[PDB]
Design a protein around this ligand. Structure first.
Ligand SMILES: [Cl-]
Ligand SMILES: [Cl-]
Ligand SMILES: [Cl-]
Ligand SMILES: [Mg+2]
Ligand SMILES: [Mg+2]
Ligand SMILES: [Mg+2]
Ligand SMILES: [Mg+2]
Ligand SMILES: [Mg+2]
Ligand SMILES: [Mg+2]
Ligand SMILES: [Mg+2]
Ligand SMILES: [Mg+2]
Ligand SMILES: [Mg+2]
Ligand SMILES: [Mg+2]
Ligand SMILES: [Mg+2]
Ligand code: NA
Ligand code: NA
Ligand code: NA
Ligand code: NA
Ligand code: NA
Ligand code: NA
Ligand code: NA
Ligand code: NA
Ligand code: NA
Ligand code: NA
Ligand code: NA
Ligand code: NA
Ligand code: NA
Ligand code: NA
Ligand code: NA
Ligand code: NA
Ligand code: NA
Ligand code: NA
Ligand code: NA
Ligand SMILES: [Sr+2]
Ligand SMILES: [Sr+2]
Ligand SMILES: [Sr+2]
Ligand SMILES: [Sr+2]
Ligand SMILES: [Sr+2]
Ligand SMILES: [Sr+2]
Ligand SMILES: [Sr+2]
Ligand SMILES: [Sr+2]
Ligand SMILES: [Sr+2]
Ligand SMILES: [Sr+2]
Ligand SMILES: [Sr+2]
Ligand SMILES: [Sr+2]
Ligand SMILES: [Sr+2]
Ligand SMILES: [Sr+2]
Ligand SMILES: [Sr+2]
Ligand SMILES: [Sr+2]
Ligand SMILES: [Sr+2]
Ligand SMILES: [Sr+2]
Lengths: 119, 115, 246, 145
RNA sequence: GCAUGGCAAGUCUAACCGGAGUAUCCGGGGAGGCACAGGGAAACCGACAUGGCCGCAGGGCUUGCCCGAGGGCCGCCGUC
RNA sequence: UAUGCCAGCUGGUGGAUUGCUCGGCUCAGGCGCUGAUGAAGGACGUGCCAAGCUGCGAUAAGCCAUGGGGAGCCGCACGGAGGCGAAGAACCAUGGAUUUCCGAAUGAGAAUCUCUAACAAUUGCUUCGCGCAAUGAGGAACCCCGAGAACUGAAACAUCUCAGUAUCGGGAGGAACAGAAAACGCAAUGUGAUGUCGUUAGUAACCGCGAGUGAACGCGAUACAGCCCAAACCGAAGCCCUCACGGGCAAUGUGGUGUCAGGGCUACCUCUCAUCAGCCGACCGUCUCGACGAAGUCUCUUGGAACAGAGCGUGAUACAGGGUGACAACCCCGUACUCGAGACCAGUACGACGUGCGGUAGUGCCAGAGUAGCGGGGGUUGGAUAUCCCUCGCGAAUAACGCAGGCAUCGACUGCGAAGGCUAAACACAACCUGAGACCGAUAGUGAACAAGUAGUGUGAACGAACGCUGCAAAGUACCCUCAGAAGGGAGGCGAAAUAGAGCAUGAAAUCAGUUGGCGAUCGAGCGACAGGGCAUACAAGGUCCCUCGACGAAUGAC
């Protein structure tokens, strides 16, 4: 709807299958040309480049994708705890760009290459 | 506190002429138009026909309405005329805006006020 | 008077008689009234729950315990307007008539008057619109309706030295206040109004601040947004002629 | 600024002592209470008067004064012009939901007219004839005797 | 009641119908209301688009003298 | 200088203010019945660890199928351990499985359990056997049928009013109810079932003729639709159960005919497209859900972060709204366009099957009784003589008759056939779905943004709160010292900020601690206003002020 309360609400309360769209990220120039799409759902296999936060400029493999919190962990994009341990700093896919896809799954690859559908 | 910008300008123009030319009617008419709308003239043709005379411009400090019959060939000057009024008047004389009259007669001479 | 017709390239292509209505004396008070009424007529009825604060058997103890005679329940004051959780004394009511009447003649006069304000460059410029043209409104060949791409309307407006107004409207304002909590965060200047004849211009409608309308039903509001007369308009060959009998 | 808008801070909002604006006692009773006692003034007096005939035994005549007819003779070009001849029935409005048309004699008649109507008043005729005109009583008008 | 505004011997549409940019808005809809004649319980009858005199504003003139809307005092008319 | 007064400063207390919105409020459109095939509701269970909420039911946050979906998942809820998922999980849609006990609660009983095969109870059919069936209870209001106040108004009060309102009893549906004239009565050569909306109209009518109460016909609209019996004349030509056999019903009449364009019958003309019954079966439209979906994440500067400024560029049938570390059409979800499905419209419209419309003449063959109507007594209504109903009593005609047209009777005239029945659409409500907003913005708005009908009160009926905000990211503070210490403190680490460190954005006043200026242990009380002195004062946002003399010099006015 046009009402802000309903918009945020339908986003926070969206069922799991509707949350994939909350972890989508724009594709690199090459990939957009290759699959005829502007973006895709970031997978734990993909490689990505950070374009906005304090880690803008870095690239790395996606190590985790959390649909519950709609965020992703990217290798080496971490924070140093008090005890010294190194933990990941969650990223919104909206500040990221996919530069390499993990197509180990026929379905995803098939979905990506089809035209009537987007992956 | 008039709302109509045209009525507001007509009043200003009426004062300009009364003060510049040797007209006392225009300033007089101005004063009446400044009064509340309910006091403005609402005259039918039957009244103009009864008290007007040719070559003497009839001045109505209000609006002219179409009831009655006008035969005399007179020039009626009013703030406004109803559609029918302006039609009947033009058939045997002429209907003019108070704005034109002020221009063709800034001195405001040979004029008869009717209400 | 006469109005110059323009082709999709922006080049002059003849001219037609500007209909008499465009000579109607400009009446900003009547126009303002017409807009005021249209704006009020779309407002929704509202009001607080009629039993709000009244769902309690709270009673006053009267004199005797050194307390004010205020209805209380479980040692808590209630119901009365001065009580926290008490009823609203004179709240908004659903039964209230929030519409405004307007005689048809008076309304129609306003439309004609707003149409006429459209043919006065000085007024249009006073209203705020940006443009480097002398003749107004802008009249264009009926082929304008056949356009499809927004960008194609862009080219034409640039050719007509009128695109500057869209640049003006290409700035949204994030309003001060809580309207934002209700979906009214943004607002923006009103730019060009496109009046066609068969259907509203789908090609022009998305332009910043643009409004599209049809000659048979263009109203005081699109002709004078907010009640301010003199909107930079662009008519269609046939629109111009159709508008003549409004 | 309206009167209402200036009341804040006044305490009594123009009511005088704050003991005045209470219930109906401040109005001497509700509605028309006391119309024969404390507030009898200017009230129509008590009592019955006259009677009414049944609504379907009542006749509502459609009337018109010669003045109206006569002032619009030329304009009524869509109506006979002889040595004017006018059937009032085709002139009077509301001449359908009326039981008949009657010509009244208010005003002057500066033309010779041949009027056709269900009924005329004495003065209506005196004037119409006196101006070189005539009056024709319709068939329905044949209810005088 | 009043102030403002539209139209004016008329004025306004109501429900509702069509259109559309779809609660806005454009067009249509005069059913009906109020006004355009009154008086009389009723039956029933049915009036000054001016006849006289004052005179404010305003206008005119040869600068007191004319014309004098509105207004004032009367006549006269309709009806009981 | 104690006790102390006034103002401020630093820190607290407190949670105002500003900003924010997962909640309300209101409007609009759509939709709309559930239950003995055991509902709605409740109880008790159910998780690896599980108190609350949610889900579920001993198969217990779930089992199966088909389609969608997709590389993740194991609810709210970010734990530990562990597990599931390419044998395609999660999740979503549709259909199915499981579905404890109490509950209409139905074998009997009982505070959710127990005792010894159960439609308990009332009914219909009946194979007279619970064999086949029905009822019961629920639902926000809406709807129909009954029972029916008072405060109040009348400035008292009794008729009247509040009001056929509140509340009570019974009952149906998705809508109800009404409905094809014994009508109307703009009286007519006129209208033509019924709701409803606008108007007629605060009119007619009522009324301590007071206060007050208050229609209708008509008209303009919405939507439209008309039919079936009883009897005459026929007289078993019939219906129900069962696969069948067979059984039950039915002469106290099943079935045919017929239904005011009256009908039937006898004699004829012509003809059927009326009606009734059944078959088939939508378009469109509306509501919802879904698929697809353009174009920057370029430079410099500031910043913790660019969504800022400046510069360059792009889409737009898309510049609605939201999200993203700050003002985003072009980063993400969407949005426009186009497309798909379900629901409603509707088993309706259309089409087709069968039936057969209608007209003439004759015929006193048929046509609804405690009725029509009158009287006694009440209620009710605008209903006045002239509303509608109840009750007691009386009580008719038979179409060649009868009722109505606002007092009664009789004639005339006009209308119409009561005492049998059914009937779509247009209208009410808001539970449910979706959308919307000059509504409120956490003492507001719901009682309820939070454990909310929660905590809690009352024997019970019933009553009933308060509590929103760390941060961009938990990076949610490692190590050390102190201490009885997982407390607290100190030092330290993180972050732009810890004066963001847990009811953790901001942080008012009242007020408290410490402290600065002024006053202060010989002095008097609306706490001040106006003058004038002391003391005090970083900048900024005010820059004037003082003395000699001179110029001007009102009223007044000298030694
Ligand atoms: Cl007049
Ligand atoms: Cl009468
Ligand atoms: Cl009728
Ligand atoms: Mg692809
Ligand atoms: Mg409240
Ligand atoms: Mg504010
Ligand atoms: Mg039992
Ligand atoms: Mg009383
Ligand atoms: Mg009563
Ligand atoms: Mg009394
Ligand atoms: Mg009543
Ligand atoms: Mg009636
Ligand atoms: Mg609250
Ligand atoms: Mg805080
Ligand atoms: Na309550
Ligand atoms: Na309202
Ligand atoms: Na008071
Ligand atoms: Na009318
Ligand atoms: Na529904
Ligand atoms: Na639990
Ligand atoms: Na179940
Ligand atoms: Na049963
Ligand atoms: Na049995
Ligand atoms: Na009283
Ligand atoms: Na009393
Ligand atoms: Na009474
Ligand atoms: Na009529
Ligand atoms: Na982003
Ligand atoms: Na009654
Ligand atoms: Na009786
Ligand atoms: Na009748
Ligand atoms: Na609060
Ligand atoms: Na001082
Ligand atoms: Sr979750
Ligand atoms: Sr969660
Ligand atoms: Sr006492
Ligand atoms: Sr007063
Ligand atoms: Sr009170
Ligand atoms: Sr009074
Ligand atoms: Sr008295
Ligand atoms: Sr009429
Ligand atoms: Sr009109
Ligand atoms: Sr006079
Ligand atoms: Sr019909
Ligand atoms: Sr009968
Ligand atoms: Sr009679
Ligand atoms: Sr609070
Ligand atoms: Sr509420
Ligand atoms: Sr008690
Ligand atoms: Sr520290
Ligand atoms: Sr001096």
């Amino acid at each position: 709807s046009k009402q802000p309360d309903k918009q945020r609400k339908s986003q926070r309360r969206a069922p799991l299958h509707e949350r994939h769209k909350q972890v989508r990220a724009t594709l690199s120039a090459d990939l957009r040309e290759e699959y005829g799409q502007r973006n895709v759902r970031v997978n734990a296999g993909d490689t990505v480049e950070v374009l906005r936060g304090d880690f803008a400029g870095e690239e790395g493999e996606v190590i985790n994708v959390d649909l519950d919190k709609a965020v992703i962990h990217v290798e080496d994009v971490t924070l140093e705890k008090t005890d010294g341990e190194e933990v990941p700093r969650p990223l919104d896919t909206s500040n990221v760009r996919v530069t390499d896809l993990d197509l180990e799954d026929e379905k995803r690859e098939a979905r990506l290459e089809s035209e009537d559908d987007s992956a | 506190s008039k709302t109509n910008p045209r009525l507001s300008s007509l009043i200003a123009d009426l004062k300009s002429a009364a003060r510049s030319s040797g007209g006392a009617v225009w300033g007089d008419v101005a004063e009446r138009l400044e009064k509340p709308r309910r006091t403005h003239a609402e005259v039918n043709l039957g009244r103009i026909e009864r008290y007007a005379q040719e070559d003497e411009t009839v001045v109505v400090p209000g609006k002219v309405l179409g009831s009655g019959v006008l035969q005399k060939d007179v020039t009626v000057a009013a703030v406004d005329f109803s559609g029918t009024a302006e039609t009947k008047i033009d058939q045997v004389g002429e209907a003019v805006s108070l704005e034109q009259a002020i221009e063709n007669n800034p001195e405001g001479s040979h004029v008869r006020v009717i209400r | 008077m006469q109005a110059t017709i323009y082709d999709l390239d922006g080049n002059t292509d003849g001219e037609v008689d500007l209909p008499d209505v465009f000579e109607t004396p400009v009446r900003s008070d009547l126009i303002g009234k017409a807009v005021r009424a249209a704006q009020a007529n779309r407002k929704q009825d509202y009001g607080s729950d009629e039993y709000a604060g009244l769902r309690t058997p709270a009673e006053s103890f009267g004199s005797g315990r050194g307390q004010a005679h205020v209805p209380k329940l479980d040692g808590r004051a209630r119901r009365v307007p001065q009580a926290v959780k008490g009823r609203s004394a004179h709240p908004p009511k659903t039964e209230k008539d929030r519409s405004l009447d307007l005689n048809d003649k008076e309304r129609q006069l306003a439309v004609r008057s707003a149409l006429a304000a459209t043919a006065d460059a000085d007024l249009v410029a006073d209203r705020g619109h940006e443009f480097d043209r002398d003749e107004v409104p802008v009249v264009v060949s009926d082929d304008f309706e056949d356009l499809v791409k927004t960008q194609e309307v862009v080219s034409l407006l640039e050719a007509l030295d009128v695109h500057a107004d869209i640049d003006r409207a290409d700035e949204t304002k994030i309003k001060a206040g809580q309207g934002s909590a209700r979906g009214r965060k943004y607002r923006r200047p009103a730019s060009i109004l496109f009046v066609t004849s068969d259907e509203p211009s789908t090609a022009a409608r998305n332009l910043a601040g643009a409004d599209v309308a049809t000659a048979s039903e263009v109203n005081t509001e699109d002709l004078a947004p907010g009640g301010a007369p003199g909107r930079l308009t662009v008519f269609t060959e046939s629109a111009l002629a159709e508008v003549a009998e409004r | 600024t309206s009167k209402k808008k200036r009341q804040r801070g006044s305490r009594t909002h123009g009511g005088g002592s704050h003991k005045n604006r209470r219930g109906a006692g401040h109005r001497g009773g509700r509605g028309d209470a006391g119309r024969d006692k404390h507030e009898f003034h200017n009230h129509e007096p008590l009592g019955k008067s006259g009677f009414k005939r049944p609504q379907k035994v009542q006749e509502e005549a459609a009337t018109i004064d010669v003045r109206e007819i006569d002032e619009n003779v030329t304009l009524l070009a869509a109506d006979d012009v002889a040595e004017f001849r006018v059937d009032v029935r085709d002139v009077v409005e509301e001449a359908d939901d009326a039981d008949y048309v009657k010509v009244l004699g208010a005003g002057q008649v500066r033309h010779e007219l041949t009027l056709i109507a269900d009924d005329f008043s004495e003065g209506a005729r005196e004037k119409v004839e006196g101006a070189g005109g005539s009056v024709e009583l319709t068939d329905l008008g044949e209810e005088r005797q």
